[PDB]
């Protein structure tokens, strides 16, 4: 960690300057949208919207009623 920090200290202070001069100390959303634009130009968007759902705060688990809905609609027994 400290090795790549030493390798990228210029980068950290550079986009630090750019964050203060563009949106005024807004490193989080700028660096986030940089990750999103890069990994969507990567054309592997499953990881991208996975990161979007996890950093927005989308819940992993779901409602019981939706489980009931999919169980009824697929006609599955309680054992399976």
């Amino acid at each position: 960690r400290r090795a790549q920090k030493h390798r990228l200290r210029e980068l950290k202070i550079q986009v630090k300057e750019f964050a203060d001069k563009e949106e005024g100390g807004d490193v989080k959303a700028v660096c986030l949208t940089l990750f999103l634009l890069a990994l969507r130009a990567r054309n592997e968007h499953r990881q991208a919207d996975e990161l979007e759902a996890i950093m927005q705060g989308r819940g992993s688990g779901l409602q019981p009623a939706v489980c009931l809905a999919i169980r009824v609609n697929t006609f599955l027994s309680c054992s399976q």
């Binding site: 949106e23 807004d26 959303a29 700028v30 949208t33």
Partner: peptide
């Protein structure tokens, strides 16, 4: 904010 942008 930036999140509001496309």
């Amino acid at each position: 904010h930036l999140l509001s942008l496309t």
